[PDB]
Scaffold this active site. Sequence first.
Site, PDB file in Angstrom:
ATOM      1  N   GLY A  22      -2.532   5.935  -1.047  1.00 35.77           N
ATOM      2  CA  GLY A  22      -1.598   4.820  -0.960  1.00 35.77           C
ATOM      3  C   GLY A  22      -0.694   4.747  -2.190  1.00 35.77           C
ATOM      4  O   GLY A  22      -0.975   5.402  -3.188  1.00 35.77           O
ATOM      5  N   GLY A  24       1.572   1.629  -3.126  1.00 39.82           N
ATOM      6  CA  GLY A  24       2.277   0.410  -3.481  1.00 39.82           C
ATOM      7  C   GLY A  24       1.604  -0.428  -4.571  1.00 39.82           C
ATOM      8  O   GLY A  24       2.099  -1.506  -4.889  1.00 39.82           O
ATOM      9  N   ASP A 146      -0.768  -8.710 -15.585  1.00 38.34           N
ATOM     10  CA  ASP A 146      -0.546  -8.466 -14.166  1.00 38.34           C
ATOM     11  C   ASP A 146      -1.851  -8.626 -13.387  1.00 38.34           C
ATOM     12  O   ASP A 146      -2.142  -7.843 -12.486  1.00 38.34           O
ATOM     13  CB  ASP A 146       0.146  -7.118 -13.923  1.00 38.34           C
ATOM     14  N   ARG A 150      -4.571  -7.488  -5.997  1.00 39.28           N
ATOM     15  CA  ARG A 150      -3.994  -6.209  -5.617  1.00 39.28           C
ATOM     16  C   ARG A 150      -4.306  -5.155  -6.681  1.00 39.28           C
ATOM     17  O   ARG A 150      -4.279  -3.961  -6.392  1.00 39.28           O
ATOM     18  CB  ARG A 150      -2.486  -6.354  -5.376  1.00 39.28           C
ATOM     19  N   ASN A 151      -4.619  -5.608  -7.904  1.00 41.07           N
ATOM     20  CA  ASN A 151      -4.779  -4.721  -9.047  1.00 41.07           C
ATOM     21  C   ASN A 151      -6.255  -4.574  -9.408  1.00 41.07           C
ATOM     22  O   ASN A 151      -6.576  -4.099 -10.492  1.00 41.07           O
ATOM     23  CB  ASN A 151      -3.952  -5.187 -10.248  1.00 41.07           C
ATOM     24  N   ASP A 164      -4.756  -1.223 -13.145  1.00 43.77           N
ATOM     25  CA  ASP A 164      -3.309  -1.297 -13.324  1.00 43.77           C
ATOM     26  C   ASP A 164      -2.959  -1.837 -14.708  1.00 43.77           C
ATOM     27  O   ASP A 164      -2.897  -3.048 -14.916  1.00 43.77           O
ATOM     28  CB  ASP A 164      -2.580  -1.977 -12.159  1.00 43.77           C
TER      29      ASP A 164
HETATM   30  C1  LIG Z   1      -1.880  -1.421  -2.735  1.00 43.12           C
HETATM   31  C2  LIG Z   1      -2.687  -0.355  -1.975  1.00 43.12           C
HETATM   32  C3  LIG Z   1      -2.817   0.921  -2.827  1.00 43.12           C
HETATM   33  O1  LIG Z   1      -1.814   1.436  -3.326  1.00 43.12           O
HETATM   34  N1  LIG Z   1      -4.061   1.416  -2.985  1.00 43.12           N
HETATM   35  C4  LIG Z   1      -5.338   0.910  -2.432  1.00 43.12           C
HETATM   36  C5  LIG Z   1      -6.427   1.624  -3.224  1.00 43.12           C
HETATM   37  C6  LIG Z   1      -5.820   2.950  -3.662  1.00 43.12           C
HETATM   38  N2  LIG Z   1      -6.408   3.350  -4.972  1.00 43.12           N
HETATM   39  N3  LIG Z   1      -5.777   3.257  -6.146  1.00 43.12           N
HETATM   40  C7  LIG Z   1      -6.618   3.690  -7.074  1.00 43.12           C
HETATM   41  C8  LIG Z   1      -6.270   3.731  -8.451  1.00 43.12           C
HETATM   42  C9  LIG Z   1      -5.960   3.767  -9.630  1.00 43.12           C
HETATM   43  C10 LIG Z   1      -5.617   3.787 -10.999  1.00 43.12           C
HETATM   44  C11 LIG Z   1      -5.066   4.920 -11.598  1.00 43.12           C
HETATM   45  C12 LIG Z   1      -4.737   4.901 -12.954  1.00 43.12           C
HETATM   46  O2  LIG Z   1      -4.201   6.028 -13.520  1.00 43.12           O
HETATM   47  C13 LIG Z   1      -3.651   5.877 -14.837  1.00 43.12           C
HETATM   48  C14 LIG Z   1      -4.971   3.739 -13.700  1.00 43.12           C
HETATM   49  C15 LIG Z   1      -5.521   2.601 -13.104  1.00 43.12           C
HETATM   50  O3  LIG Z   1      -5.751   1.453 -13.812  1.00 43.12           O
HETATM   51  C16 LIG Z   1      -5.586   1.607 -15.223  1.00 43.12           C
HETATM   52  C17 LIG Z   1      -5.844   2.633 -11.750  1.00 43.12           C
HETATM   53  C18 LIG Z   1      -7.777   4.054  -6.521  1.00 43.12           C
HETATM   54  C19 LIG Z   1      -8.934   4.545  -7.009  1.00 43.12           C
HETATM   55  N4  LIG Z   1      -9.027   4.744  -8.324  1.00 43.12           N
HETATM   56  N5  LIG Z   1      -9.976   4.836  -6.213  1.00 43.12           N
HETATM   57  C20 LIG Z   1      -9.848   4.623  -4.835  1.00 43.12           C
HETATM   58  N6  LIG Z   1      -8.637   4.108  -4.347  1.00 43.12           N
HETATM   59  C21 LIG Z   1      -7.634   3.837  -5.199  1.00 43.12           C
HETATM   60  C22 LIG Z   1      -4.334   2.648  -3.783  1.00 43.12           C
END
Ligand SMILES: */C=C\C(=O)N1CC[C@H](n2nc(C#Cc3cc(OC)cc(OC)c3)c3c(N)ncnc32)C1
Length: 279
Positions: A22, A24, A146, A150-151, A164
């Site tokens: 994803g 967004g 933030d 969502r985060n 995030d």
């Molecule tokens: C709004 C929906 C969307 O875009 N998602 C739903 C869950 C999906 N998702 N995102 C992550 C993540 C992350 C992340 C990466 C970073 O890199 C620098 C830093 C972060 O915070 C500092 C967060 C995610 C993970 N990690 N596992 C499973 N699903 C994930 C996107």
Amino acid sequence: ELPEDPKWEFPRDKLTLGKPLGEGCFGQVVMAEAVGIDKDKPKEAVTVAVKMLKDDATEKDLSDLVSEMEMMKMIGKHKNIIHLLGACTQDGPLYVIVEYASKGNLREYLRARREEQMTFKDLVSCTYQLARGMEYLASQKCIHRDLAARNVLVTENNVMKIADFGLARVINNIDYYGRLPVKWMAPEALFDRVYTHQSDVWSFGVLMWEIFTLGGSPYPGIPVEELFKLLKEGHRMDKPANCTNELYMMMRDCWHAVPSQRPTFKQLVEDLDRILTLT
Ligand SMILES: */C=C\C(=O)N1CC[C@H](n2nc(C#Cc3cc(OC)cc(OC)c3)c3c(N)ncnc32)C1
């Protein structure tokens, strides 16, 4: 040009990119397999998430990605914050490897359970965990800026993990002096252009509302355009139905107009501990 950081560097030939997750909420994140990233299990292939630039990335995106990775090194390790596992910074595209959270973000997780149905205890536990996360962030002199459902990412074991850090800053002991989501912003942030840990406490209140409405949209029916005026007039959100009077009073405390009149994250943790152990 990126300086090498050997203790964080992960080999590209041990990383296998897979399904996109994803776009967004945390930028372009992809599911991946990382061979021997978990040093407790040096043979094991570990499921991880990988943040990278899209083909249409801006200079700001590259800047932000580096910055976000560096932020993750500074803040350190805590159960209720997403863990940095490694990075590919040399000879190819910048990949930042983070912990995989199999149950997505908190907003979707809660909406989906509006199929393991949420109990009251679960919602309080969720709230405690995030308060604990923020107590730690604040203790590292970091402001998030933030904080929203969502985060927040949810692991296989239902562990809440603050994520995030795109807008996150490390500050000193004095106030940090419009890329912040309006419905989550503290008045002093919106009007005075200052941010403290007590601004994060405001946001936490809005997060609390989100949790108890099982992923509801804050200030329902009210457009962002009109929230500037209503905040000046002292509008606050009504009590959620799944919420006790006690927990809503904690919500309202977080929404005190005077930042130093709001509770600290330390106090929130203590209060939620009490509530959690009683129920
Ligand atoms: C709004 C929906 C969307 O875009 N998602 C739903 C869950 C999906 N998702 N995102 C992550 C993540 C992350 C992340 C990466 C970073 O890199 C620098 C830093 C972060 O915070 C500092 C967060 C995610 C993970 N990690 N596992 C499973 N699903 C994930 C996107």
